[model samples]
Target: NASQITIQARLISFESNRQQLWKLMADLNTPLINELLCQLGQHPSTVVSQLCQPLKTDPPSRLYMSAIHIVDYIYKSWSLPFPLVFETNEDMVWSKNQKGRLCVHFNGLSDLIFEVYCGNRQLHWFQRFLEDQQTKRKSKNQHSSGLFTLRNGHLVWLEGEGKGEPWNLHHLTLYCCVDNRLWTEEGTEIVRQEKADEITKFITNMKKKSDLSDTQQALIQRKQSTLTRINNSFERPSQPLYQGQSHILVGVSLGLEKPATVAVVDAIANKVLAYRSIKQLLGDNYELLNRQRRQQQYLSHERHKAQKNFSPNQFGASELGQHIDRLLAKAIVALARTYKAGSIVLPKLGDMREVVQSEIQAIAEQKFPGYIEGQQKYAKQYRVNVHRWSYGRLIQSIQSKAAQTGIVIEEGKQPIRGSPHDKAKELALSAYNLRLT
Candidate 1:
């Protein structure tokens, strides 16, 4: 009878008060959580579980448990509170089994889909069907029947399951359809419209900031203006019809060997449209007089003879000056033509600098055969230098003339110095009427 007896007790005065202090040391933002997890030397999942353990079994733990459960759901499912819409009619579906295993299905073909599951759940199946095609054959079917586990949110695939069987037979796939869905004739449309408006505002602000910071637009504008000027200069008529357009005036100096040929080329097109020669244009008598003057000057300087007392027959002063004068005239005339309004278009200064250096090298090798060999011997202490100023001067003359006519000069003169061979090559290039396109 005593063993069968039941004991009952009631307290007349009993009071219970429950209070909870919900405090988070750091803001509950994703970045903060991530940083905290890192500092704690534990995964976010582990840290969260430990922190929430005390609230799970307490009587007044309902609010804490609800908050933590919502957070856990978000973390595990990798879901956002907002809905994301695509420009195309596509949908994605995700599902999980009783054991917390996940399966995914995509609807549209040629559309990208991304999934990130944060919980410890294995992917059980994946399937794709080509409904558009009438063929009876299955499109794509895959599954994992083996007991594969995801530990600490790591994904692992289990292959070789259900040997000798089609993949579709072994696993369950969650199918998702990507298509437009009409809302019910109720509050659904209002909610969707409000969400879309909010999204639109966000997008507008982002676009405005992006456009404001764009430097590329300004750069493109400048380039377009430069190109316009270059095009106009190229298309302009060669023959000046009026004085305003006819900024060019031809001049002749006699005493040259080959009647110095001068040509002005459109470097952009590599076309030589204008040409003149001193020998063809100037008469023989004027050429003789020019020759005599140059010869006398050369003789007077060479023999240290006084200008007044210089004798042509005895010192051959007149004869030497004649030859020198002829060569000088030819060189000058060629240079003058090159700098004319319709002359050759120069290349970019930086590129010309490199070409000049290479040209110098070639010239030095021809003129001084063993100079380069000596350069290698004293490479550490001694070095060779080339004068790119001559080339620069030529470029400058052309540019200056072009500027007056509002024909934009695109190239600049770059200073360059290098080996003897380099200097020789540069000099040779400078001597010729070469145009850079």
Candidate 2:
């Protein structure tokens, strides 16, 4: 019974711009200017004459002035707050002048809509009283929710709510001053269609599932043992992996490459048993020779540096300081290779070192006779205390490379504190150094 109780209210021409007044209200821009001219006590003909002079002298400024005056009048007359403000660079200010063109100028309506939705829920019951409140009030429970006009204007109120039922009245009204022409029914329909298309596109794009091949899925699944190995290795001392329990090394890369690649390394079997290089399989030109060279150089540098004794405090080395050094080094090397290849796309790390190194090197180099020599000497001195002094040099080199490539690297994620991977990697490399010696 509660579900069957239905309350409905309809505007006979709500969506239809049948009435001339409704059509005027829908065209927000021109009507706005007309309303302001009318308030200024100019006749419609005289108002057009005054606006024509400003339109030729400075159209944007004239349009903006018109919007301001219209908004001010609406707020004062309707007792509604100003809903939007224009910035110098906002797209709406540059809208094209055309009849029935719903351009960026109407973006202010977005703010108005937001305000309307936020404040209108309480006044839903008064829709029916809007046209003839005096006649309608006598027929219903004098307290029935319907449309009514207050000092400001029309609103709706609803009463006695159930599920999906209107408690009072839910009402909406469109208003336009005599001169407002941009709020036409055609313009409103265009805006509605654009909004619907955007929503539909978003939903469609999001519905696309990951199209991993069978081999790729298998590779990712095989990484379970490797994940377990990592988790076990980092587990509390009291709980350890079972004796003689064979653990695998699964390396799962969230390959963002087109077609993508996933690799699984089975440490227990001493094999890279599960491997999928999607580009290679598909025979695509996605593989960059420069990228391969860069990765080789980076991995080589990392492996070489891993052999050294890294003192977190030997040369003003805080935990964070060491991490910064490693990240900058990796980023610099990556950028150097990227820049050399004439690619404009800057990776996250590459961008970070570009900015930091440039600023730091610029300030430091100004003090020495030859900037490069001075930079090298300064880098070496920093290295005396820092385990990886090459970091500063790497930063300088990468930045120089980026400048040559006509690219500006942005700041990337900052180094975090207490990263165990950094420490473990350092320790592992140090052990490798001893074994080699």
Candidate 3:
């Protein structure tokens, strides 16, 4: 899969160069944007090209096109009367220093480019990406360098009309040739081309090994930080299917008493291999679900207080809730992966809202008897829990996560009749049978 990393950087350029860049951006934001907005219903390509020609002569066509695209997207997606002026440097091409540190050059902008001041974290991800690209290029008998430039220093000719002469690294040159500087996590400055080749080479070799330690696994799992947008084609460690552990299905049951119940079954034999609560499967992350409830309680109250027509319609309204759902889905999917389950079965919760509401109403009636106030109190007490269940969200998340892993997803019956565990087991078997066909 092709991935992209975007890192934040500061325009640490000369005053004159910075002013020129700003002036170009301001021109795009003002007259060009106003012109595009006035001709809103017109075809974007036609309008953009017509309006952009004047700006195109000054700035590079790439930069002009990028501005027009940003304007078009904003105009189409929003309902604001006035234009929301935004600037972006989407017209970037990759460049690298002699020491292999990657740099990004903006189209038509001379004497300066953004220096990634964020930290070493961003640089490390770029390093990995460049190294991996070099390795792949070697295998493919292609050019080893990520950046491609022509003899006349025209980078655009690579995608231009005619075939251009192939150029080598020896013929390459950088404009202005400013030294790149990076900051470390602990507030130390690191100059570009400062040698750490031994450490980097050691890490590269370590990454090739099949057996990675827990820390190594964790390290890779952590999100990478970057500023410059670069295409990353880093293939993660492959998932090797075990020889004997085929034809398995994992079923999950969502409930009021528990977040979920999971059952693994051998589909070939139709026998239950293991049955456990998703809480047990998730270990410490299960606590997020517990916290999710309390957070939702407060969220419900806060929304109700603030907005008159507030509805509990959005899934994962809070960041914490979103985290819980994401991690829960990840854990459930991980369980299937570890168990070598070919498919995941989650409860079909289409009619669950009415069912839960009625169930709660019944309990409220039982506790309150004939008094309306008592029933209201009972309903009010449990309303947050019922409204915030978000079973469908969990199912949706599981389906999404499963799709990424290439695992088949099956929807089991709602389990309206029997014990959640037994229903989950039966659903697992039935889903397995469905897969057999």
Clashes of each: 19, 41, 4
User: RMSD for each model, in Å, please?
Assistant: 35.4, 28.0, 16.6
State which candidate, 2 or 3, has the greater lDDT: 3
lDDT of 3 by residue, 32-138 (tens): 65556555756444566567666555524454555565566657674111221213322344456555446656655655453322257555544443454455555
Highest-lDDT candidate: 3
Global CA lDDT computed for model 2: 0.31
Error of 1 at 386 (Å): 5.5
| Candidate 1 regions with alpha-carbon error over 4 angstroms | 1-343, 368-372, 375-386, 390-397, 406-437
**Candidate 3 local lDDT, residue 158:** 13
Candidate 2 ranges beyond 4 A from true positions: 1-22, 26-28, 34-124, 127-132, 135-149, 154-437
Highest TM-score model number = 3
Q: Tell me how far the alpha carbon of residue 34 in candidate 1 is from the true structure, in angstroms, after superposition.
A: 50
Residue 149's C-alpha lDDT in candidate 2? 18
lDDT of 1 by residue, 271-364 (tens): 4445445444244545653555455445435566454665554655334333434444344344444455332234354465455444445455
lDDT per residue for candidate 2 within 1-437, as digits (tens), equals: 00011122222222232232222233434445555554455322334445544444332333344355444545456312122223222222212224422122223233221112212432222221122233333444232111121111211222323444221122333221110111233322333354345545644554465545885456444443323222211111132211221222212111111112222333234444344343432233234322433444455455567677643323322243333333333443333233232221112344334434443444445556477877778755533322222334334444444443233332222222112222222222232233334
Model 1, position 234: C-alpha lDDT score = 13
